[PDB]
């Protein structure tokens, strides 16, 4: 679907992984 102007994918892709890592890492927080 060209014509559009995508320019917010990088924060979203990071928001996805950051959600997975932050979820596991949240288990620690006891160092």
Swiss-Prot record:
It comes from the Eukaryota. It is found in: Membrane; Mitochondrion. The chain crosses the membrane at residues 9-27. Interacts with BCL2 and BCL2L1. Interacts with C1QBP. Promotes apoptosis. The BH3 motif is required for the induction of cell death. This is Activator of apoptosis harakiri. It comes from Homo sapiens (Human).
